[PDB]
Amino acid sequence: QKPYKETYGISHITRHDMLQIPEQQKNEKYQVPEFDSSTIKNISSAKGLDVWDSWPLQNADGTVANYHGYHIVFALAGDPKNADDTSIYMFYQKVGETSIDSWKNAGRVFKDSDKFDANDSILKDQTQEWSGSATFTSDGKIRLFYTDFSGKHYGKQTLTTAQVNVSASDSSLNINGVEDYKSIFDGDGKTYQNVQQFIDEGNYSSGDNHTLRDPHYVEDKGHKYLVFEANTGTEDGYQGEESLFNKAYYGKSTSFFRQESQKLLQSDKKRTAELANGALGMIELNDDYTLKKVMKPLIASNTVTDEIERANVFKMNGKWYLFTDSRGSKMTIDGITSNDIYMLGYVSNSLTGPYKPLNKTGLVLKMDLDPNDVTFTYSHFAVPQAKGNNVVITSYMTNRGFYADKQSTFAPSFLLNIKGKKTSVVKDSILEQGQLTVNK
Ligand SMILES: [Ca+2]
């Protein structure tokens, strides 16, 4: 194949930028702070469940919602002994409370029968409920977005929505049921990979990693959008042998492309790089939360990784910030190790781009603790605040199923300062486990 250059009109996580991160991450400004293990508790109301990926009910701009005097957090939870047991639970606290013990458990959002009652062909084949977002609508409704995962159908992932009906009193919140429960998007082949394309390759034994998940709701000028984890399709730079010859994925210069591409082609990461075509996708929704328009990806990670998770985007003090989490173990970049886990980040003057890397490289947070460390954290997520230069970073702590007495739980939150195209972790800014806002 001959070298070429094609950006497909989207932004790219380039090899040159990623190569700078191993040295840069030694700076404490870009590091998840050390946590004190003797302060860490299980979520008392979870009654022995692992509780991992979590997200707050948000207003349209990403700030934390107030539902009838309560904060609400949705989270994946399940039996630590069963890695395929994943359902969405709803936790809640009175606004003003900060202790992890303040989080009550309203239980599962869904009954097993809900996916059938929905009259939705894709939903009736669901086996797990994976991550998403939740927005608090202008008419006072809890509008959930999540990932319908189907183990029956080779790990199909479908962006899904429902309204969660919740009664509020002075003491409790109670889930009454759901409505408007429907599949929104399962890929289109041309812009975002679908599960058939995964099956074409030989599914899991191909080494390909198909994703279409973690939908994050946001609005701009009254238009409604989901930004989500995906993989590219056939028309915006697909996986394949030819992808390694696209200079847009390398950056820097032709000299760098020649050197880096020849190294990659000679390496044991050639196949991994060919398969790697992660993307942060975007769709516009209609006012009833159905699909209006498939839009081009905000950014892609061709050759670098197939898996960029927990898509997040919001406007803060005049700029738009786009984040994603990614494991070094699934990357193909020299100097990045299997211990390294990142939140990467990008900035634009507009929701729809173009996005350029924060801190020159894309690095925002680095966590490299051993998987066995009780204070291991993952699924880092920046929660915008109503005012100021800080966001709150939430994450889950402790790997699923590792310890009998220490379950996956809410990590201590901490602060990230954002100004312009730069970020820095705020010194000694550790908050309570699962704390969503600085204000209280
Ligand atoms: Ca792929």
Side-chain angles (χ1 to χ4, degrees), residues 3-27 29-46 48-80 82-151 154-189 191-241 243-262 264-405 407-418 420 422-438:
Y4 62 103
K5 186 165 172 202
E6 182 54 70
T7 63
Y8 304 97
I10 66 168
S11 302
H12 301 279
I13 299 181
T14 67
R15 298 192 71 80
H16 174 277
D17 288 349
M18 294 300 294
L19 278 168
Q20 311 316 304
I21 289 179
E23 185 63 30
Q24 191 188 28
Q25 71 183 44
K26 293 165 56 157
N27 196 317
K29 285 178 178 179
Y30 316 118
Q31 293 180 355
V32 174
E34 183 161 83
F35 299 114
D36 183 356
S37 64
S38 64
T39 67
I40 304 303
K41 302 185 187 154
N42 300 319
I43 298 162
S44 60
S45 65
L49 296 167
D50 279 337
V51 184
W52 57 110
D53 294 15
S54 71
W55 57 97
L57 177 69
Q58 291 177 294
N59 305 309
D61 66 2
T63 57
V64 174
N66 188 325
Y67 189 80
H68 296 254
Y70 297 94
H71 291 144
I72 289 171
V73 167
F74 295 91
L76 303 188
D79 193 333
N82 188 353
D84 297 338
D85 177 20
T86 309
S87 308
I88 297 165
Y89 279 69
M90 190 178 85
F91 295 90
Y92 66 97
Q93 63 169 186
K94 292 181 176 178
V95 172
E97 299 186 308
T98 56
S99 176
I100 188 170
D101 298 323
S102 75
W103 293 99
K104 295 177 75 190
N105 186 358
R108 276 189 63 196
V109 169
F110 296 109
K111 305 172 185 41
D112 287 334
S113 56
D114 285 338
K115 67 179 72 70
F116 300 103
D117 292 352
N119 295 325
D120 190 287
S121 301
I122 291 169
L123 268 167
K124 65 186 184 64
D125 291 332
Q126 182 185 86
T127 62
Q128 295 181 55
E129 301 160 11
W130 287 6
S131 309
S133 58
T135 194
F136 189 33
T137 71
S138 72
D139 74 326
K141 309 300 183 174
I142 296 172
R143 173 51 62 166
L144 178 68
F145 301 96
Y146 82 99
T147 303
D148 163 358
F149 177 82
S150 181
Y154 296 100
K156 189 183 179 74
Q157 292 150 66
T158 299
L159 310 189
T160 306
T161 188
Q163 172 171 299
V164 190
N165 296 325
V166 177
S167 295
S169 72
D170 297 349
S171 47
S172 69
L173 292 183
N174 296 267
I175 297 163
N176 301 127
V178 302
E179 64 184 74
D180 200 36
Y181 188 14
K182 57 198 180 190
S183 302
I184 296 173
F185 189 57
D186 78 333
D188 68 342
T191 314
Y192 303 107
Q193 195 188 49
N194 59 37
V195 75
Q196 183 52 53
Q197 286 167 309
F198 182 57
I199 293 162
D200 285 340
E201 304 272 2
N203 64 96
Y204 294 104
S205 57
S206 73
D208 201 18
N209 180 8
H210 173 69
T211 76
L212 187 67
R213 62 174 175 254
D214 300 3
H216 183 75
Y217 183 90
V218 66
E219 292 195 19
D220 191 34
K221 308 210 169 280
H223 294 260
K224 307 178 156 71
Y225 305 94
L226 296 179
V227 173
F228 51 93
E229 168 172 19
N231 299 88
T232 59
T234 55
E235 297 188 355
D236 54 359
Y238 202 46
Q239 63 197 36
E241 293 179 20
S243 74
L244 302 198
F245 299 91
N246 188 346
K247 294 186 190 181
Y249 304 150
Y250 291 76
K252 188 53 174 190
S253 69
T254 285
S255 184
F256 172 76
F257 161 77
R258 285 182 190 321
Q259 184 166 312
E260 178 72 4
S261 68
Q262 286 300 305
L264 181 57
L265 290 163
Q266 291 285 301
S267 75
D268 64 2
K269 294 284 168 191
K270 175 178 179 288
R271 172 67 170 167
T272 300
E274 290 166 344
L275 289 160
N277 70 325
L280 303 184
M282 188 180 254
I283 60 177
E284 184 173 2
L285 307 183
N286 301 299
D287 287 332
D288 62 4
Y289 305 103
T290 59
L291 176 65
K292 190 193 287 292
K293 186 167 62 176
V294 178
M295 300 174 70
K296 68 188 184 178
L298 296 186
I299 197 161
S301 62
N302 294 84
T303 86
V304 174
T305 180
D306 227 359
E307 192 175 272
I308 41 174
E309 314 194 290
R310 291 303 305 272
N312 188 23
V313 68
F314 57 83
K315 196 183 182 173
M316 176 174 171
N317 300 318
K319 305 287 187 199
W320 292 85
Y321 297 94
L322 174 67
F323 301 98
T324 179
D325 299 322
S326 207
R327 292 177 189 274
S329 64
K330 297 189 188 193
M331 294 176 184
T332 60
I333 300 297
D334 288 327
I336 293 179
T337 70
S338 59
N339 275 83
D340 293 307
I341 287 163
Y342 301 103
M343 191 176 76
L344 306 173
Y346 305 83
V347 61
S348 183
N349 295 336
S350 295
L351 170 56
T352 51
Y355 282 88
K356 301 185 171 187
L358 287 171
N359 307 307
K360 301 180 184 194
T361 60
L363 174 65
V364 180
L365 295 174
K366 183 268 285 176
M367 200 285 314
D368 62 12
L369 302 180
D370 195 283
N372 292 348
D373 198 317
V374 64
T375 66
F376 175 97
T377 54
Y378 197 83
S379 213
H380 301 83
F381 183 85
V383 182
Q385 308 291 299
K387 71 189 201 324
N389 293 338
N390 300 316
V391 301
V392 172
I393 305 301
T394 65
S395 56
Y396 81 85
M397 177 169 283
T398 312
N399 271 129
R400 295 171 61 194
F402 272 39
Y403 295 114
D405 308 328
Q407 284 84 57
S408 300
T409 186
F410 296 154
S413 299
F414 60 97
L415 298 186
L416 180 76
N417 194 255
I418 303 180
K422 292 171 67 165
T423 69
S424 72
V425 171
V426 180
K427 185 76 163 167
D428 297 333
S429 65
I430 295 164
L431 305 171
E432 296 300 319
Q433 285 181 79
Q435 190 168 335
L436 300 174
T437 62
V438 181

